[PDB]
């Protein structure tokens, strides 16, 4: 389970800027913090973990000052290093079964430039040389360094471990996939691309293949894992066959939420009927 705090900061000019961030434990969103807002918002009932109303308030205020501070710093760094500017900051820890490890990566205009490593900021190999001075300035602050180290070394792992027992439930929830078939013209003359749509499954790991009874098709392509709004997943597995060779193919879906009982969709009664309920005029088709 990888826990990441993700910060988005935009600087349009000297006077206008905003910063927004969100927090992910695994693929679940736990917090959100908008520029419009004073405080960090929970997106789960258990987002506080095992910290107490006092402990969290202190950690919150800590962040509240940071956000104001980070803002003025960068504006000043820019006056030093003679807009528009985008900064991205990713920090957290990947929990091992032990034990763990931490990270605080910073990106500038889309590129990965700085990390916090050991007791200070350093520029990542192959970084621009103008950043040397800003890092020299930023490393002269003992106070930030101290608080950042505690955050990474002690505070972050002790927090996440709180979430993993508090969100025991929502993390180990199971959701059954629902699949359906369809096909589209291939890019090749007289071939057909067949689609097996799989939707609404959690957790993420899943097995989808095109079969011919025994032999699973080697031309089976797995698409990207796309998200649903309700924290479930979407995948499609496609197969290119020469038109008139669809007959005898089957989509097979293996996922932990079913147990032993797969979804085996055959190309041809069940199929025919579902293809009738999704008919349309085919504008526009790509």
């Amino acid at each position, epitope marked *: 389970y990888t826990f990441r705090c993700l910060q988005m900061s935009s600087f349009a000019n000297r006077s206008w800027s905003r910063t927004d961030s969100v927090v992910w434990l695994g693929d679940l969103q736990t917090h959100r913090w908008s520029n419009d807002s004073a405080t960090i918002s929970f997106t789960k009932p258990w987002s506080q973990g095992k910290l107490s109303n006092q402990q969290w308030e202190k950690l919150q205020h800590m962040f509240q*000052v940071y956000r104001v*501070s980070f803002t*003025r*710093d960068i504006q*000043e*760094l820019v*006056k*030093m290093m*003679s807009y528009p500017i985008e900064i991205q900051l990713s920090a957290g820890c990947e929990m091992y079964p032990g034990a763990s490890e931490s990270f605080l990566h910073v990106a500038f205009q889309g590129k990965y430039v700085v990390r916090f490593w050991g007791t200070s900021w350093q520029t990542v190999p192959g970084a621009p040389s103008w950043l040397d001075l800003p890092i020299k*300035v*930023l490393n*002269a*602050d*003992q*106070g*930030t360094s101290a608080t950042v180290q505690m955050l990474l070394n002690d505070t972050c792992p002790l927090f996440v471990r709180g979430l993993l027992e508090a969100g025991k439930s929502d993390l180990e929830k199971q959701e059954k996939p629902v699949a359906w078939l369809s096909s589209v013209p291939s890019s090749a003359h007289g071939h057909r691309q067949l689609v097996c749509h799989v939707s609404g499954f959690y957790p993420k790991p899943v097995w989808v293949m095109w079969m011919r009874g025994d032999q699973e098709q080697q031309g089976t392509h797995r698409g990207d894992f796309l998200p649903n709004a309700d924290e479930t997943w979407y995948l499609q597995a496609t197969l290119d066959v020469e038109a008139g060779e669809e007959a005898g193919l089957a989509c097979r879906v293996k996922h932990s939420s079913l147990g032993g009982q797969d979804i085996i969709l055959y190309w041809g009664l069940h199929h025919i009927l579902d293809a009738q309920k999704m008919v349309w005029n085919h504008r526009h088709h790509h």
Partner: T-cell receptor
Amino acid sequence: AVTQSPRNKVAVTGGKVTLSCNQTNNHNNMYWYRQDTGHGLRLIHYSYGAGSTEKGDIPDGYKASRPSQENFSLILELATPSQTSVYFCASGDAQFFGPGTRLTVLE
Amino acid sequence: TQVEQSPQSLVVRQGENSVLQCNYSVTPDNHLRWFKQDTGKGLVSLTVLVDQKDKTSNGRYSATLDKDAKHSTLHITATLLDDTATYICVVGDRGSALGRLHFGAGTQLIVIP
């Protein structure tokens, strides 16, 4: 360390006044404050190195300039009574302050 | 007006002790510095206080810091006639070159013979 010239100056409303700071410390950051009773020092203009110049909290009426690491002038294009004060430049990374300049602008 | 100093002017018998108060609301408060200003001359640093509960000593000068209360006091042991100057409290909002200094209007200490 930090030298200032002139130390005393008398101007007319609408005159030009340059106040010169100089440092042999080799610092990058130079500042210009002004001191008035009941205030505590107030930043007019500051600098991060040669050729760079910045607005402080009260820069109205003042242009500054940093030709080199060593020198940081505060310039008063159109002097006004309001600008009667004691001015201090400081150098450093926090700071080290000059012996001050006393300016009067008279009607 | 984030740094306020107390009392406004102080008067001590030459030989006695004097106490100077400083209250600030600057956020954040990285460090606090006491300066001496000999009438006619510039500011000169006496001491800096860093930690959440700090206490320093510069010979006859001794200072205390309390961030939880956002407060510092400067003590002078066995005041001299040389001590007749203005004492200025300055707070720094970062631990580096990017910080802004925040100046108190000062305390005027007259040391009577």
